[PDB]
Design a binder for these strands. Structure first.
Lengths: 151, 79, 157, 100, 206
RNA sequence: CGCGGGGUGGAGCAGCCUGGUAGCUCGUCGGGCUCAUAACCCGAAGGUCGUCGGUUCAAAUCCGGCCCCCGCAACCA
RNA sequence: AGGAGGUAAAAAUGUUCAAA
RNA sequence: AAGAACCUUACCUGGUCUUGACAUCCACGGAAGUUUUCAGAGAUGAGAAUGUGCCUUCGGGAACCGUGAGACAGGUGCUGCAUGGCUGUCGUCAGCUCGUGUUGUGAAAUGUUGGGUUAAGUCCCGCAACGAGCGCAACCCUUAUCCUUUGUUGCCAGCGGUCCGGCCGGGAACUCAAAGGAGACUGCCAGUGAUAAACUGGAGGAAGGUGGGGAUGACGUCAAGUCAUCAUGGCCCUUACGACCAGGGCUACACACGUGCUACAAUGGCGCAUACAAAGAGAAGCGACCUCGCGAGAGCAAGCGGACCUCAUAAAGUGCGUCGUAGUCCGGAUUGGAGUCUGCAACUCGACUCCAUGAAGUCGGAAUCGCUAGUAAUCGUGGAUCAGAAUGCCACGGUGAAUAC
């Protein structure tokens, strides 16, 4: 934060197929620490996706994922008090991180039923990238190019 | 809501009540036993129950019986 | 502008001692404004404790027409607030006559009640006060009767 | 805390031992499911005959020294402030500033 | 408001407790209470005895009482008879076999409680405080104290607005746990009012 | 006396001219920011429509008398 | 080292006397 | 305030006390004490009985009780701006001084500044400064690995019997237990840097750089807080502001705020089955089992003052099923009835159980707080206090993140 260097803590790979990326994805969707249940959702939801599209678990995932990955984003520069939003390329880590985050977010709404299904459908919409999550991505890209006058 | 091992009362009050009953509807009793539960024989009596700065008389109407005397002497005055 | 101390003494106990018992939730009536006159007669009320509804009064007798067991005697031992109807033969600033005598009088006068023109041209002021020595009552009343326009000036029950 | 109060305390104990514990049988076996008769009644009645105090419920457990009626760590029998005063002084055996 | 009572933190690691007896919660508090009694009582009795510290022990039913102090003479009394006097009264204080025993402390100037009594008693004698303070420090320091720090709190000098003044020479490492310290307190009772005294003494590092 | 205007939340003003449903601004009340008040921000209560009577299904509103205030006129005399 | 360029809108107030 | 029904209790109301509720002193009388009755809210008032005891001032008793008088007694009565004691706090921030010398007439500066470096006036270098002290760190406790010693009430691998319970022989290896110890030091290497301190990366390692936690809080600031822990100068009352008793009030309720618990559900509730803890407490106390009860509990009642026995089968979790987004099986408030226990006493004013009821609330305006690791969040356990009485506090472990550009 200040001077302190970060210790990019290691994340254990997912048990059913060592996808450390998905592992952290669970960690995002996870709530109150009941990781087992979180993992239960992520799985059944992932299967339902694989079932659905016809694509296998994770491969369908990143395909559904990249289609929401922000490339840039606003940031608040100022000069003594003159605050104004600034576009800036996102870190790849922070990139897919924000991707999963927004995905879980749009998943928070869209009251179909169980999270597994609601999430499944969100990623499914990402498969053709027209779901609510991508609405966030576009919005941020507008927040970029409709402000791309800073560097 | 409690003490189902003989409804609770007071020797001085009880005896004062019996003494009154067998003596007829005499002068109102002036007990401080707000703890005292009412008993059947009490009906008709006008026992006064101190409640801080009075004795607020209460006729022992039929209804009340299991009720403790305090419930008939409001203590905190308001408006 | 000058409108409980007189009843803060009853709230300080004493006065009424029904059948020889002290410190009771007594409280003076209204239709009858008992003072240590024809003694008084008590009446137990559900809430409010004992009601000192004066000795010999209709509403008291009504209660004598219902639950006699509730009825009880009354005493005094060691009197406040009353109302005296004092009808005037119309005023027009003649309330001043009433307003005049108030000085040497030492009782506080709470609510200055009145009325007049409804029918025969003649006012009918009534007055709440706070009596002390019962003698002082008699000491004052005549002065009220004295004023010529004051045809009526006796205690109202 | 008021010599009077400390005194009141002592008296409470005195009676708690001059009566109850040795006369608490009324409150005890005679207020049980056996002597259903008026006996049981008179018992829970002779109870009030006794002094209001004496009943251990009224014992306020004040600080042995000061008299303060609160923070009385039964274990030491002292009011928190005082149990500390002795503590830091080492007057209490094996009692040191916990730390882990 | 800040500083932890030195002796407290230095208990287990360096300085042994004034008491040394075991007891279950059963007869615990009682033993402690009696301890308090023998403490304050015996203190009053030996108010003039320049008493240092009075260790209390309970070796099974027994109730030993070591009394570190200056002048064993006035302590024990002639023929040591005054001891058995305190014996009788003390055992009557704990309803048990009080085994009193005394070890004279060699140098009073170094011991804290003894210094505090000096100071306090002197303020009680209406001597200016500053003189007594510098006096104690000179004495204790030259005598061999590796370091010392004395403080006087309160009205002092009859001033109408209480304040605090202090002194200290050489190393007096209070945070250094291993470092020994002899902290103690006493207080004057001048007609003006209570005037407290604290006094630290770094005698040795280990 | 004559002609016209007005009287509406605590205050100043719309709404009346074309009847049913009275709004804005400050002020007031509660919360927020602040070390604390102001400002600022969030939420809120408030007006028997001068008084009396009438027409109407309904009157703040259409009609009249009355009380008050302002404006105009009060000339040849 | 020699240098020029860009670079920070608004934001009031605090009753009087008083510690060796 | 670690725990207001009485008590506590300081406040109110009324009934009462006066050398007193409590202490030292002296005179006189009476052992102390114990039993039961009447009045009264009780205090106490009147007693009616009964008992007369361990050294002899052997005309005593030491005692304890009663009475008398004067000193006193007593105050939770004001003053924390008269105080001690003690605590919060800026702040675990890294600062704060002094001796001497020196510069300046002097208030003062220098040291402590400066280049680097650190979590740090930490350390190195330079410097009219040389040194020293309070601090910083270290020393301390806990945890993280291993070794040694000991083997019950703990442990079970190796063999045996096994009524499969470490249950019994028996085993000391192991988990563990509690002491005595090993280990971490920028010690090793690379590089950056002034061959300085140190810093960056790697090695070995349980542990890597102050490993994580805690305890420890400088000179002082606030004339902060407390005279109600206590102690104390003052001043104040002293047939009373002191003392006892009953009931009462501290729990009042148009309203405002702070701090928390329980929710608004589907990462869920509910029904059934089933998995893995730690840390504690305990005797006028924890209290199995067994029995009746829907239960709260009640009867009987072992073991236990404790690695034994009890509190006390953990819950989140997992398996299975149902409900299927409704104010809905969400929510549990509120309310009626019937009950339990503690306790003289549950009305004001207790905790808990059952049946019944079943509201607001459908993620909260402006604004605002906590949190960087096994933390937050979520989950249940226990303890102090305490007769009973927590969603508070104190402590315990389970599950276990996000992000630091």
């Amino acid at each position: 934060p200040r001077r302190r260097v970060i210790g990019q803590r290691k994340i254990l790979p997912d048990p059913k197929f060592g996808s450390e990326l998905l592992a952290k994805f669970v960690n995002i969707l996870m709530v109150d620490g009941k990781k087992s249940t979180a993992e239960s959702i992520v799985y059944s939801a992932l299967e339902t996706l694989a079932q659905r599209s016809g694509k296998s678990e994770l491969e369908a995932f990143e395909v559904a994922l990249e289609n929401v990955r922000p490339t840039v984003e606003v940031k608040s520069r100022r000069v003594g008090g003159s605050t104004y939003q600034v576009p800036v390329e996102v870190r790849p880590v922070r990139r897919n991180a924000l991707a999963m985050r927004w995905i879980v977010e749009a998943a928070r709404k869209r009251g179909d039923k169980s999270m597994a299904l609601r999430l499944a459908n969100e990623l499914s919409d990402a498969a053709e990238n027209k779901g609510t999550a991508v609405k966030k991505r576009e919005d941020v890209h507008r927040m970029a190019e409709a402000n791309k006058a800073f560097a | 809501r409690s003490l189902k091992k003989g409804p609770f009362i007071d020797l001085h009050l009880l005896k004062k009540v019996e003494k009154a009953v067998e003596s007829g509807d005499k002068k109102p009793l002036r007990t401080w036993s707000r703890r005292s539960t009412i008993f059947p024989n009490m009906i008709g009596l006008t026992i006064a129950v101190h409640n801080g700065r009075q004795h607020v008389p209460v006729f022992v109407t039929d209804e009340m019986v299991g009720h403790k005397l305090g419930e008939f002497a409001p203590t905190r005055t308001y408006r | 502008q000058l409108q409980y101390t007189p009843q803060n003494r009853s709230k300080d106990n004493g006065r009424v001692v029904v059948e020889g018992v002290g410190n009771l939730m007594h409280h003076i009536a209204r239709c009858c404004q008992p003072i240590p006159g024809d003694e008084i007669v008590g009446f137990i009320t559900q809430g409010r404790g004992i009601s000192v509804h004066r000795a010999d009064c209709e509403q008291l007798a009504e209660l004598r027409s219902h639950a006699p067991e509730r009825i009880v005697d009354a005493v005094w031992g060691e009197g406040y607030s009353l109302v005296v109807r004092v009808v005037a033969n119309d005023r027009s600033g003649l309330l001043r006559d009433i307003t005049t005598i108030l000085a040497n009088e030492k009782v506080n006068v709470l609510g200055v009640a009145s009325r007049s023109d409804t029918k025969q041209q003649l006012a009918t002021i009534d007055m709440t006060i706070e009596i002390y020595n019962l003698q002082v009552l008699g000491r004052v009343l005549g002065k009220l009767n004295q004023v010529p326009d004051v045809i009526d000036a006796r205690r109202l029950h | 805390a008021k010599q009077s109060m400390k005194a009141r305390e002592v008296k409470r104990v005195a009676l708690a031992d001059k009566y109850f514990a040795k006369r608490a049988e009324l409150k005890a076996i005679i207020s049980d499911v056996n002597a259903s008769d008026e006996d049981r009644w008179n018992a829970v009645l002779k109870l009030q005959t006794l002094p209001r105090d004496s009943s251990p419920s009224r014992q306020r457990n004040r600080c042995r020294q000061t008299g303060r009626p609160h923070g009385f760590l039964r274990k030491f029998g002292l009011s928190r402030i005082k149990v500390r005063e002795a503590a830091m002084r080492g007057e209490i055996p094996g009692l040191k500033k916990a730390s882990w | 408001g800040q500083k932890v009572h030195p002796n407290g933190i230095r208990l287990g690691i360096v300085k042994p407790w004034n008491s040394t007896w075991f007891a279950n919660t059963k007869e615990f508090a009682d033993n402690l209470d009696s301890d308090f009694k023998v403490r304050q009582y015996l203190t009053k009795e030996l108010a003039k005895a320049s008493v240092s510290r009075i260790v209390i022990e309970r070796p099974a039913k027994s109730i030993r009482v070591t009394i570190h102090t200056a002048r064993p003479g006035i302590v024990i009394g002639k023929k040591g008879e005054d001891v058995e006097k305190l014996r009788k009264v003390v055992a009557d204080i704990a309803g048990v076999p009080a085994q009193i025993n005394i070890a004279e402390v060699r140098k009073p100037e170094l011991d804290a409680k003894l210094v505090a009594d000096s100071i306090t008693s002197q303020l009680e004698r209406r001597v200016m405080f500053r003189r007594a303070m510098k006096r104690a420090v000179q004495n204790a320091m030259r005598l061999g104290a590796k370091g010392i720090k004395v403080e006087v709190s309160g009205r002092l000098g009859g001033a109408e607005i209480a304040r605090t003044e202090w002194y200290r020479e050489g190393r007096v490492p209070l945070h250094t746990l291993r470092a020994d310290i002899d902290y103690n307190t006493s207080e004057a009772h001048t007609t003006y009012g209570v005037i407290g005294v604290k006094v630290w003494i770094f005698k040795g590092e280990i």
